[PDB]
Amino acid sequence: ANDIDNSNPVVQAEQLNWLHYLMNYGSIVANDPEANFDGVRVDAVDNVNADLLQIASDYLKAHYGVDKSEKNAINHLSILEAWSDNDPQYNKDTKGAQLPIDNKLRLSLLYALTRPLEKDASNKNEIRSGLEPVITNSLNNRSAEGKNSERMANYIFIRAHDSEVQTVIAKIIKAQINPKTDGLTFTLDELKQAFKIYNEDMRQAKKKYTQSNIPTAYALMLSNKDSITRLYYGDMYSDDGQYMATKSPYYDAIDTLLKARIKYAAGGQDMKITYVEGDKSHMDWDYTGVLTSVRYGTGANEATDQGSEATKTQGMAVITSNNPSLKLNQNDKVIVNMGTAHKNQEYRPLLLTTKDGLTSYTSDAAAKSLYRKTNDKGELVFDASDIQGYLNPQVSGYLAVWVPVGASDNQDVRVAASNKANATGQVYESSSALDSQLIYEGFSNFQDFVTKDSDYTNKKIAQNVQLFKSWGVTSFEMAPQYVSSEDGSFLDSIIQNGYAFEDRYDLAMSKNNKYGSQQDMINAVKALHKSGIQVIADWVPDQIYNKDYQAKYGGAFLSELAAKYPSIFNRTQISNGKKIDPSEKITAWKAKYFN
């Protein structure tokens, strides 16, 4: 493991050369422009690598014109891995071309929904919070008093390949397999033993290790205005085993929410907590907060907006408690204001919590008899017969989603990208068009190695494109495709592909990666493009492991890039106070380019 010296202007030129290779991989290697990557995931890791964010952003502007229209920006959707303590402000202050993480809301969701109650807990900080932070503690404050400040473009997730997976396995191994584990380094046999317990724990009502209320997390993220959700592979399927071989217990609930977002999620948003009095004598944790989140549908931005009759079948309500023992007394009410656009209108449940889990309703007719009609002010009223705390595999508390009756089967409330430049001059301005995008992180670190060729991740991706389309996936984030090194160090033990590599330019070419052959990779990218889904490339310029493809392609494109995109070469970089130096090609990594 060697840290690359990204303060060196010749290295900075090589990192640009590599970015160009990844995004034009099809044209350069396969002579096939349908096998190119559309967007990039930038993972700079360290503050010393700051300059690479401006180099990447300058390339995306010059090559794709992402700064010249919303359309160009949305058609090359790019993201920033968690980097600084304020990625949104840093990306804005620099004129950067990547979506930042809404890290504040990610932590608000984890601590309000997924952590255990006080009794069954690790320490004071791993105690489940109230729901109040889910409204206010976000890059975009969604309270009545906070929603009117400038909105910031962002992506949100509850889990990822590198987030809220390994840390759970580490707990299981330390508790039950190998006390005196140092985390970080595990054997394949330790992982296999841990994943048997992990998979059992995830399917239980009482979760010792895994996250509570994952469906509730998705209901809130997918219905939120001014955000793009990144769906995690491991929330739909098992984090271990063959690719897409076993569904997660949460598959059906999240599938229901993904389809409903396309059909109903539009117009303005209001969020509110109602503190019911409660029974208390029949309650453990005394928290009586019930969160509601309403979308008004196209044409209505506020509770008082009229809308039109042609938008009546849009909008939705999410109702949630995070308290498994919540009981309303017989006088308690939760009022949900669906808006003045939704007076005297029939609503039916999409999702309801029961003793056993979540009931999903695939049509209006499936839920006839559960129909409820708003009053002349546009209010639904729920009481003790509707809302109750439950403890089941799906829910710790209560989850309901309500939708207006009468939507057509193929109703789609998503908005096309504007052809105009953003007035604010940002690459990504928060909008209904940007909210219409959804990213899928389509891999887990802990996928099993294949038994036969038919198991390969990249073959399965090409075979299931229409499933991804039905979920509203506009951007598919593929695993890093670099041929893996084989040694002691977690990225090499599980061969997650890139992350641990000896050749930056070797994408399943000297041999298969974990995910299949060069042709399997190419065909997955082509299949996704044929149904209009973008593919994101994984740009990881921090490290390299120790006549390859670095030799063939190293510095090969700098002449062409200098001729076409001079703006990239004219910038004086902040950290070293120098322009990038393309006068030397890096055809082999040596000590001179490390630290």
Author numbering: 423 to 968, 1006 to 1054
Question: What sentences appear in the manuscript?
Answer:
While fructose is released, the enzymatically produced glucose molecules are sequentially fused into a growing glucan chain and, depending on whether a 1,3- or 1,6-linkage is formed, the resultant product is either an insoluble or a soluble glucan, respectively.
The new structure of the catalytic domain of GtfD affords a structural comparison of the three S. mutans glycosyltransferases. When the models were rebuilt after obtaining molecular-replacement solutions using homology models based on the GtfC-CD structure and the GtfB or GtfD sequences, it was clear that GtfD-CD had missing residues; in fact, the final refined structure of GtfD-CD lacked domains B1 and IV. Our current structure of the catalytic domain for GtfD lacks domains B1 and IV (truncated at residue 421 because of proteolysis). GtfD in particular shows several different residues, with one prominent residue (Thr589 in GtfD) being the decider for the type of glucans (soluble or insoluble) that are formed.
